[PDB]
Amino acid sequence: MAVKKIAIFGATGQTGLTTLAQAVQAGYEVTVLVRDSSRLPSEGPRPAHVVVGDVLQAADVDKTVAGQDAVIVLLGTRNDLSPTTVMSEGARNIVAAMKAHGVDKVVACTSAFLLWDPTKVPPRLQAVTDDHIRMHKVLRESGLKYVAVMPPHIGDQPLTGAYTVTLDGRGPSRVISKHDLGHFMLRCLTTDEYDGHSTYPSHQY
Numbered sequence: 134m135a136v137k138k139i140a141i142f143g144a145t146g147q148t149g150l151t152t153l154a155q156a157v158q159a160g161y162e163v164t165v166l167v168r169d170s171s172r173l174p175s176e177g178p179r180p181a182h183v184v185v186g187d188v189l190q191a192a193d194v195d196k197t198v199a200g201q202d203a204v205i206v207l208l209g210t211r212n213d214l215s216p217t218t219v220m221s222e223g224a225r226n227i228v229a230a231m232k233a234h235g236v237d238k239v240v241a242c243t244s245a246f247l248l249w250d251p252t253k254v255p256p257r258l259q260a261v262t263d264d265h266i267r268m269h270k271v272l273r274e275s276g277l278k279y280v281a282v283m284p285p286h287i288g289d290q291p292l293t294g295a296y297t298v299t300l301d302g303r304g305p306s307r308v309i310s311k312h313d314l315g316h317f318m319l320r321c322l323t324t325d326e327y328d329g330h331s332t333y334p335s336h337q338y
């Protein structure tokens with residue numbers, strides 16, 4: 134039984150937009166939860182289903198997760214570095230909705246800071262990193278099949294599909310293109326080999 138139907142959270146963000154386009158082009162039936170639909174593009178591949186709402190609202194999340202085979206999480210805070218619980222509270226709602234609807238696979242992006250020396254996080258990113266840690270804890274303790282994607286700097290290099298995935302935060306570089314990161318999140322839908330693991334995609338462009 135391959136995954137066919139997925140929900141993407143954070144589909145309008147930098148990585149979300151290209152993950153969404155790639156998923157639709159690849160044949161998935163994609164549902165997105167967006168606060169503002171004007172942030173979805175008109176050109177290119179289009180999601181099958183658009184739910185307007187907020188990941189902080191359980192009912193909105195429930196509507197989005199119902200019926201899916203898997204969930205991709207690309208939530209983030211754009212340029213806001215303030216203390217925050219948006220991602221972890223969103224993940225709480227996602228896990229509850231997954232359990233309410235029988236969905237058992239989640240692929241979620243946090244950051245390579247969760248693999249690197251936890252005393253080398255740049256001060257201005259510490260608050261966001263603390264919420265990534267809370268989000269990781271929520272997902273790992275959910276018991277669901279969870280692939281933790283922990284990328285380094287997200288760049289705008291082209292899609293290659295040729296990046297390296299390690300399990301410990303060491304790799305050929307400290308950059309992954311947004312397009313390659315999205316491609317990897319989709320890869321995680323068709324294998325179990327990363328379930329229960331932390332993954333570090335990187336590439337020399």
Ligand SMILES: NC(=O)c1ccc[n+]([C@@H]2O[C@H](COP(=O)([O-])OP(=O)(O)OC[C@H]3O[C@@H](n4cnc5c(N)ncnc54)[C@H](OP(=O)(O)O)[C@@H]3O)[C@@H](O)[C@H]2O)c1
Nearest residue numbers: 143144145146147148187188208209210211244285286287
């Ligand atoms: N930038 C880097 O180099 C880097 C490196 C490693 C890890 N990361 C982490 O990687 C993840 C993905 O980063 P990104 O740059 O692709 O993300 P991003 O551009 O920050 O996009 C965040 C996404 O989350 C959505 N979102 C935020 N609050 C929400 C809410 N309350 N309800 C529903 N959706 C909400 C945003 O929606 P709107 O469009 O409505 O704002 C947007 O779709 C983030 O957690 C980031 O911290 C970033």
Ligand SMILES: Cc1cc2nc3c(=O)[nH]c(=O)nc-3n(C[C@H](O)[C@H](O)[C@H](O)COP(=O)(O)O)c2cc1C
Nearest residue numbers: 211212244245246247258261283284285286287307
């Ligand atoms: C593991 C890792 C995680 C990162 N996480 C973030 C993050 O959540 N948010 C961010 O703004 N930058 C993060 N960065 C680096 C930023 O993307 C980088 O400072 C960015 O180029 C700043 O661009 P701007 O000034 O246009 O916002 C991360 C880098 C690495 C290696």
